[PDB]
């Protein structure tokens, strides 16, 4: 029921004084729908999903103009931050920006975001009130004072509560077949004899959407963390995700262990047990 639209921007000065990399990617939930990448020699905001290709030339001209505008402001930002932190041009630095909106089950505005990182750490973030800023350090307070005097939060609030949510709803209706689907995980358990004394039980979830999932091990109905292993949810490369959870168990004790799968595509949570 609940949904999100997110833009992710990475700006990388590389060693020396060459032109920086700029990449923009747009997501609805866990589905990329647009891209622009200077390293791929992008000249236009490009579609990445068939449902967004349906938008006409005025959409694409506008998104191309805006993404080029974002590229320009990141190019300034890189120089500004060198100045704020007294850094030379010789080093490689990274600016990240993320903005977007979430809607609830009723498709009304739940939350907005607008935040930056510099060299892999928080720089500044729009707070939930969409009126105030969290400056992570002294340098970011300069940005905060500037953005307060210019009423930037008030302009962002207009986009995050209005445009962002209005266009997210349009996409959810136009890309219905893709965006408003759940693909339930295909689940199975494997067994690998580590030695005469121990066996690995691996609990598998394949071809699920969205990415959000919980795999937990229980032992005789009690939560089990010790001798557990859980890999990051990973993309299959067809718009679905994969994940496994493993536990190493004493030989002959396999039957005590259950893997529990939760996903919004499932009628009900699943329980898997190793079976002779």
């Amino acid at each position: 029921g609940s949904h999100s639209m997110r833009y992710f921007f990475t700006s990388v000065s590389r060693p020396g004084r060459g032109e920086p990399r700029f990449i923009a990617v747009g997501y609805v939930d866990d589905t990329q729908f647009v891209r622009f990448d200077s390293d791929a020699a992008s000249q236009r905001m490009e579609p990445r999903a068939p449902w967004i290709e349906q938008e006409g030339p005025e959409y694409w001209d506008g998104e191309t103009r805006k993404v080029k505008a974002h590229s320009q402001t990141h190019r300034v930002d890189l120089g500004t931050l060198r100045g704020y932190y007294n850094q030379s041009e010789a080093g490689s630095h990274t600016v990240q920006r993320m903005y977007g909106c979430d809607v609830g089950s009723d498709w009304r505005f739940l939350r907005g975001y607008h935040q930056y990182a510099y060299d892999g750490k928080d720089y500044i973030a729009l707070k939930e009130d969409l009126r105030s800023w969290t400056a992570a350090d002294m340098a970011a307070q300069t940005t905060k004072h500037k953005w307060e005097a210019a009423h930037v939060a008030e302009q962002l609030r207009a986009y995050l509560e209005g445009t962002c949510v209005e266009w997210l709803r349009r996409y959810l209706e136009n890309g219905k077949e893709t965006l408003q689907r759940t693909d339930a995980p295909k689940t199975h358990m494997t067994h690998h004899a580590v030695s005469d004394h121990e066996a690995t039980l691996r609990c598998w979830a394949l071809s699920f959407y969205p990415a959000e999932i919980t795999l937990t091990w229980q032992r005789d109905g009690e939560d089990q963390t010790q001798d557990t292993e859980l890999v990051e949810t990973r993309p299959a490369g067809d718009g679905t995700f994969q994940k496994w959870a493993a536990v190493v168990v004493p030989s002959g004790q396999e039957q005590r262990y259950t893997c529990h799968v939760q996903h919004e595509g499932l009628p009900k949570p699943l329980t898997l047990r190793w079976e002779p």
Binding site: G26, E63, H70, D77, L156, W167
Partner: peptide
Amino acid sequence: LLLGIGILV
């Protein structure tokens, strides 16, 4: 839809 205003740190 992208943000339509220019912000600078």
